[PDB]
Design a protein around this nucleic acid. Structure first.
Lengths: 1129, 305
DNA sequence: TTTTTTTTTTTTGAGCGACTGCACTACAACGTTGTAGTGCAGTCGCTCTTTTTT
């Protein structure tokens, strides 16, 4: 490999950047981004400068893409400032400024980059795949709009249930017994094949043929057993083998067991006594007959139906999932990768890749260790050897720890074998040089410590500015790596975990006890820093040992937070308490739910309080009354107002904050409240939110929003973080108590060392088990490197002679089967004394060891201090006056029109019919039929409806007898919308007396009550029409439910006007028309131009009665001026 | 937040039924919650599953095993009960339901070979007792002249042993010389020998004192974890509790195993009645539960054979 | 077409591998007996990761 310079990297063809742990990878990506933007390098430069919309940056984590985009934006702004000023404070920026000859054009390009940074092409893998599928949808064959699903386990379980229904149900008993012996149900099969159903489907070594069913395999195994049974029945009754000292004389009794074995062929599991009839075992303890050879041939391979069912499940379930998502039109995360791979797999889609070469003729791919083989197949399809495009694979083979998710280091080894150039970062800027020397001493004991030929380890170099980092104790300077060797010959797993957790808790309380007195310090040159609780971090691998560390640390009065906690908030007790509280609020009549909800830990009541509440009936009456008030707030204001009034009236937030350990409970309660308020806005029903909360309690599925957050950030806490969640982070002091714990992989799923493809061996072959255990050991070594390279000042390791075998004292330990023992014992099996000598052999100034001492003196010292005085501001006056823009509604034989259905919707339909119809043109019956078809009413009403409409239109409504047909299109104006201002507070008592002074219809009609309205008033006049130089207003009313006979006289219409309170609406209409005619026509007189107001009752118009149906009223011409003076000011 | 445990006034009534004592010694904290202050935490029922039951686990398997054990204790036709359970859909479809019914019939026949090996026809009798001025009225079902015979398709647990010990105390106090036997699954057996009336009345007065103590203060007697701690510390050979540090560590290990279970078995600490009192198991409350279990659950393992 | 009641929970781990005790024969030491090796059965530790992409 070669060293990497950011200003000397040739951006041509494919380049592979190997950025080690702790190196400035995020700085190098920004430097290469500035190099691609400005076009620097000279001979090794790009042929043309590229814009922001042509630079493609690929990083998997979305927060990493956001942080990288912000860092690139800050670097763009800093380089623009340094180019405008021709000076800088950074040496790499100094060389960047020295490489360019022109300053104005580079500054203009950086300004354009700063302006176009919003349209930057910095996306994720699946985001870039979705953008390429949506953009060039023709060559791929993708829908323009689709619905992404976050969880795919439900459809996968449905397809597995469909496979179990269509495969396991019609089987007979002799096959279903073996199917039940393999798996209990489809859930165990789904748990087996869940790592293979997602992502790329692997290649099965020696698959069954497509015509072989379960019955054919069962009959083949039955015939294979029956041949051995026939050969045992033919060769029975004889014994010619020599009697050995190991061979007991009871073996014929075992043969008698075989005499009890050959009864029927309905069974599947043979006897163990056939293991006594093996020629390889009888010779080691003389076999002449080939019956022993046939028995050994029968026991050579396992008689299992499991592989055929697994192959049929992998062929059927994925196809059913794809069929269901193609029918529903949904898409998944890996479905974008599969669609892009199938698009580039086609003939025309290669030209689509050329369009991608038209789109982005460059690629900088970060985190190449977490790369699926479909992703590398796509990147080889686009950017293999084409000119003018550059490929920069920035990654680290020593950090590939996501093999469970879908990543594969063999794809990275294939990529390293395909490319020619290799570049590495020599300088390490994170850790102290002692930790760097400890890592370079531990990992370079033997050659190829990562056990793969394509993953080489290099000695890294520390930083010059961080060469004085020292973690000092009270006694002397503490070394970098301190391998705490647990004393003993052989120990278990749980006892070793408990002792190392106690040793780690003792070290934490010793570093925190001496840290608060200025004894243990972190020193950078002359600067010193005390060690707080947030500096020490414990690196674990699973959740059980994390809970063990948390319990062993809270036993010594030390609070610890879990950063890797992905548990849902709906699975705790607080969700059940919120459900009980919502059930008590929704149903407060039954006292059982209210009594069960009041005694929860959220309310904080004692047993004596519950007893006195059950004894005193008046206190329970007050409780029921305030819970009914909470229900009224919940129905009128929402979820969060009810919860805030409950937390303010009961004062449970102050009680939870005063309680030690209740802050996490209060944050979980607030998060559950926020989720309930988010889910309650989309549901109009009140019980639907309670059912949704009960469903999310019963559904333990984890979303991005429904996880637990950090309880506090101000108080320093010991942070527990897993090895996968510690990638890219930084910790001062790191403790690794369970770095010696390993796990043996049972399933045979490996990768070929030549073709670099995934090979799944369903048979129990030991070669596939060893080839999978080699990849497991490589993954454990990568996890060991990731967990070791996060410490800055000090790392501590827990070494112990752990024996995975159940034997107590066998003379050998299994530390060589772990990742740490392969580097300590140099890949050789040794003992506890051998492990101790291997620890004591590599002893330097940075690497030391000590024994594990169990002991406790005192938990901690709180050293509390009094809180500062504070108060809350109070609003002196009202936030705003009563300003509201309202309307009139806010201030308040067989076919006949009498038999018409009375409602708001038929009234609006008749209003739309009178609005859309032209008054000059005659009414056409087919138009009325088309309008009734568009509205959806009955077709039989139409010939009565058109003659009723013509009878209404023929009837004149005026004091002179003017009909509606005499009004031209210029004279009419339908649905005039007006806004009326008012600056005075509208008092009802000062307005109703002024109305009653002039309006004769206000003899009865007691006044309505409405608040002071200051602002605008909306209104919609139905019709305004002029005739012979005189304006007229016309409104329509069409409810008329209570009349069927001819009783709609002027008295009944006046009673309807007094009851429905249309007098105020008509007076505001006259005021609006007066103001409009005053504003429009100059020299306007109210008596000369205005003529009157007409109300039209549609169901009251008769052919013989011209007065019935219409209602003409004219004001006294004195109320209008006083109302204008009142509304004006 | 003050502690939920408070000394409450409680007067012991004259007539205390046997069903109240059985509901108390089945779960003491639940009986303190749902009967003294009448607070019963009502949990919502589980949702309807999206698919047919392919396996049998939980309450449905226990009900099937209980009906199969009640059918095989009278030597009835198991195939008729198989057709009855298959006609309701509670069994899996096809051959898998037949396989499940065959293995459950094998297990229940293996249990019934021990159950009806010493079974005699017995009737339900009345119990009227007067202990320390407290009247106990109730009924005991299936009282055979050999003693007490109970069978349940469950595992070896301390709550069923406490129930059998309470039934043996309420049976031996009014006549009834004979043993009391309970047969569980996986060769589990609770046996108590016959005792005199004075020792039975003394232990019944001790249980009455524990009942009247459980109504005032929450009686912290964990059956499962306390019984595991006790049987780790008890020695039946010498009839004395050991005090060495190795037994004190193994009892703490068994208590932490029985309180908080694994990822497959729901432990005793995962309960709505215990999380209301404390959120984290403190060693002071652990020693209090240990002392209460040594005070109360000691005749369970003292007379066990 | 009218209308009645009702408050009790339960259950849930099993395969892999070792420790120890009893029986069974092979073979050498002193026909018979003691020691050693192997097979079967009752009893008991132990343990089952990590995660996010619009």
């Amino acid at each position: 490999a070669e060293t990497l310079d950011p200003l000397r990297l040739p951006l041509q063809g494919e380049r592979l950047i190997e950025a080690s742990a702790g190196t400035g990878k995020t700085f190098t990506i920004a430097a290469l981004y500035l190099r691609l933007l400005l076009g620097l390098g000279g001979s090794a430069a790009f042929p043309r400068p590229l814009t922001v919309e042509e630079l493609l940056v690929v990083t998997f984590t979305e927060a990493a893409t956001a942080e990288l985009r912000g860092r690139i934006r800050s670097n763009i702004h800093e380089l623009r400032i340094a180019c405008l000023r021709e000076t800088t404070d950074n040496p790499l920026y100094e060389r960047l400024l020295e490489e360019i000859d022109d300053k104005a054009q580079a500054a203009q390009w950086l300004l354009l980059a700063e302006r176009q940074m919003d349209e930057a092409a910095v996306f994720t893998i699946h985001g870039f795949c979705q953008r390429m599928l949506n953009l060039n949808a023709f060559e791929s064959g993708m829908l323009f709009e689709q619905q992404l699903i976050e969880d795919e386990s439900l459809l996968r379980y449905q397809a597995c249930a469909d496979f179990w229904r269509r495969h396991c149900y019609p089987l007979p008993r002799e096959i279903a017994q073996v199917v039940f012996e393999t798996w209990k149900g489809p859930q165990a099969l789904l748990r087996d094949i869940n790592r293979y159903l997602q992502g790329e489907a692997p290649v099965i070594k020696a698959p069954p043929p497509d015509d072989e069913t379960l019955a054919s395999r069962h009959a083949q195994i039955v015939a294979r057993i029956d041949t051995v049974k026939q050969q045992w029945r033919d060769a029975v009754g004889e014994l010619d083998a020599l009697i050995e000292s190991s061979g007991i004389d009871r073996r014929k009794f075992n043969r008698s067991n075989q005499a009890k074995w050959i009864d029927k062929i309905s069974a599947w599991a043979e006897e163990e006594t056939n293991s006594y009839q093996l020629p390889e075992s009888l010779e080691k303890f003389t076999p002449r007959h080939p019956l022993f050879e046939a028995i050994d041939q029968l026991l050579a391979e396992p008689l299992s139906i499991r592989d055929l069912v697994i192959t049929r499940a992998l062929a059927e379930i994925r196809e059913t999932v794809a069929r269901e998502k193609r029918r529903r039109g949904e898409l998944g995360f890996d479905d974008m990768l599969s669609r892009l791979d199938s698009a580039l797999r086609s003939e025309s889609g290669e030209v689509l890749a050329a369009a991608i070469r038209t789109r982005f003729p460059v690629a900088m791919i970060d985190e190449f260790q977490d790369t699926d083989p479909q992703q590398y197949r796509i990147f080889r399809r686009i950017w293999h050897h084409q000119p003018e495009t550059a490929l920069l694979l920035i990654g680290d083979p020593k950090q590939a720890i996501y093999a469970f998710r879908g990543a594969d280091i063999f794809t990275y080894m294939k990529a390293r074998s395909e490319v020619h150039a290799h570049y590495t970062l020599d300088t390490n800027w994170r850790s102290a040089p002692g930790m760097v020397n400890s890592v370079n001493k531990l990992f370079s004991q033997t050659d190829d410590a990562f056990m793969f030929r394509e993953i080489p380890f290099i000695p890294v170099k520390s930083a010059g500015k961080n060469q004085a980092l020292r973690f000092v104790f009270k006694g002397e300077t503490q070394p970098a790596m301190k391998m705490w060797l647990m004393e003993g010959e052989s120990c278990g797993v749980g006892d070793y975990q408990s002792t190392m957790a106690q040793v780690c808790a003792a070290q934490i309380r010793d570093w925190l006890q001496a840290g608060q007195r200025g004894e243990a310090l972190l020193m950078n040159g002359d600067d010193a820093r005390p060690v707080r609780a947030s500096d020490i971090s414990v690196l674990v691998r699973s959740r059980q040992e994390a809970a063990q560390v948390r319990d062993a640390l809270t036993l010594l009065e030390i609070p610890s937070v879990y950063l890797s906690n992905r548990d849902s908030v709906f699975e705790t007790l607080e969700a059940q308490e919120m459900l009980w509280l919502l059930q008590a609020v929704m149903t407060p009549e039954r006292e059982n739910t209210l009594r069960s909800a009041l005694a929860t830990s959220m309310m904080g009541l004692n047993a004596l309080d519950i007893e006195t509440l059950n004894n005193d009936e008046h206190a329970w009456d007050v409780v029921v009354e305030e819970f009914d008030g909470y229900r009224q707030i919940w129905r009128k204001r929402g979820v969060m107002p009810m919860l805030r009034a409950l937390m303010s009236a009961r004062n449970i937030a102050e009680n939870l904050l005063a309680t030690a350990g209740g802050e996490r409970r209060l944050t979980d309660i607030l998060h559950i409240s926020e989720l309930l308020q988010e889910a309650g806005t989309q549901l109009e029903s009140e019980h639907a939110l309670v059912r949704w909360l009960s469903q999310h309690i019963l559904e333990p599925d984890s979303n991005a929003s429904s996880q637990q957050m950090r309880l506090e950030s101000d108080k320093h806490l010991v942070q527990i973080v897993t090895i996968h969640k510690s990638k890219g982070l930084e910790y001062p002091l790191v403790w690794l108590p369970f770095i010696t714990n390993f796990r043996v992989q049972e399933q045979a799923f490996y990768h070929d060392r030549h073709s670099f493809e995934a090979v799944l061996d369903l048979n129990a072959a030991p070669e596939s088990v060893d080839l999978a255990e080699a990849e497991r050991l490589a993954e454990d070594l990568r996890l060991l490197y990731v967990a070791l390279t996060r410490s800055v000042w000090h790392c501590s390791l827990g070494v112990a002679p752990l024996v995975r075998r159940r034997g107590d004292k066998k003379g050998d330990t299994d530390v060589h089967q772990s990742a740490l023992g392969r580097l300590l014992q140099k890949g050789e099996p040794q003992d506890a004394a051998g492990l101790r000598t291997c620890i004591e052999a590599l002893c330097d100034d940075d690497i030391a060891w000590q024994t594990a001492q169990t002991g406790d003196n005192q938990p901690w010292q709180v050293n509390d201090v009094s809180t500062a005085e504070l108060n809350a501001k109070t609003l002196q006056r009202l936030p705003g006056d009563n300003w509201r823009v309202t309307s009139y509604s806010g201030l308040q034989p067989t076919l006949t029109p009498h038999q018409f259905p009375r409602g708001a919707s038929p009234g609006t339909f008749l209003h739309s019919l009178f609005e859309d119809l032209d008054f000059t043109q005659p009414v056409d019956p087919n138009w009325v039929r088309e309008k009734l078809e568009l509205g959806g009413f009955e077709s039989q009403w139409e010939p009565v409806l058109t003659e009723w409409i013509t009878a209404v239109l023929q009837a004149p409504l005026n004091e002179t007898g003017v009909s509606l047909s005499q009004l031209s299109a210029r004279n009419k104006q339908v649905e005039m919308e007006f806004y009326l201002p008012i600056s005075e507070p509208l008092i009802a008592s000062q307005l109703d007396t002024l109305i009653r002074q002039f309006d004769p219809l206000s003899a009865g009609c007691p006044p309505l009550e409405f608040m002071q309205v200051r602002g605008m008033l909306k209104g919609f006049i139905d019709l305004v029409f002029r005739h012979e130089g005189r304006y007229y207003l016309l409104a329509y009313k069409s409810n008329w439910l209570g009349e069927d006979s001819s009783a709609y006289t002027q008295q009944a219409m006046a009673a309807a006007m007094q009851a429905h309170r249309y007098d105020l609406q008509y007076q505001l209409y006259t005021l609006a028309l007066h103001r409009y005619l005053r504003h429009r026509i100059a020299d306007y007189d109210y008596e000369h131009h205005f003529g009157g107001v007409i109300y039209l009752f549609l169901r009251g118009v008769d052919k013989e009665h011209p007065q019935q149906g219409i209602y003409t009223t004219r004001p006294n011409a004195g109320l209008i001026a006083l109302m204008d003076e009142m509304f004006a000011g | 937040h003050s502690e939920f445990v408070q000394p409450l006034p409680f007067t012991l009534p004259e007539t205390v039924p046997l069903e109240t004592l059985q509901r108390f010694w089945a779960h003491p904290v639940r009986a303190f919650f749902q009967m003294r202050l009448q607070v019963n935490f009502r949990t919502e029922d589980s949702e309807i599953p999206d698919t047919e039951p392919f396996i049998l686990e939980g309450l449905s398997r226990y009900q099937i095993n209980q009906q199969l054990l009640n059918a095989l204790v009278e030597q009835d036709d198991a195939e008729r009960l198989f057709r009855r359970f298959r006609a309701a859909g509670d069994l899996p479809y096809g051959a898998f339901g037949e396989i499940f019914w065959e293995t459950q019939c094998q297990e229940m026949q293996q249990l019934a070979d021990r159950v009806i090996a010493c079974r005699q026809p017995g009737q339900s009798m009345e119990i009227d007792l007067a202990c320390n001025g407290v009247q106990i009225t109730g009924w005991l079902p299936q009282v055979q002249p050999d003693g007490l015979l109970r069978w349940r398709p469950s595992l070896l647990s301390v709550a069923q042993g406490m129930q059998l010990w309470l039934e043996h105390l309420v049976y031996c106090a009014s006549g009834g010389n004979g043993e009391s036997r309970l047969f569980l699954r996986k060769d589990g057996e609770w046996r108590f020998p016959p005792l005199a009336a004075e020792q039975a009345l003394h232990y019944l007065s001790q249980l009455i004192e524990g009942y009247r103590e459980g109504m005032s203060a929450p009686l912290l007697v964990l059956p499962e974890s306390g019984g595991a701690w006790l049987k780790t510390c008890y020695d039946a050979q010498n009839d004395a509790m050991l005090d060495d540090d190795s037994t004190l560590q193994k009892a703490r290990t068994k208590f932490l195993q029985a309180y908080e279970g694994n990822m497959m078995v729901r432990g005793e600490g995962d309960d709505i009645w215990y999380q209301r009192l404390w959120r984290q198991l403190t060693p002071e409350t652990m020693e209090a539960i240990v002392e209460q279990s040594q005070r109360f659950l000691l005749p369970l393992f003292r007379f066990n054979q």
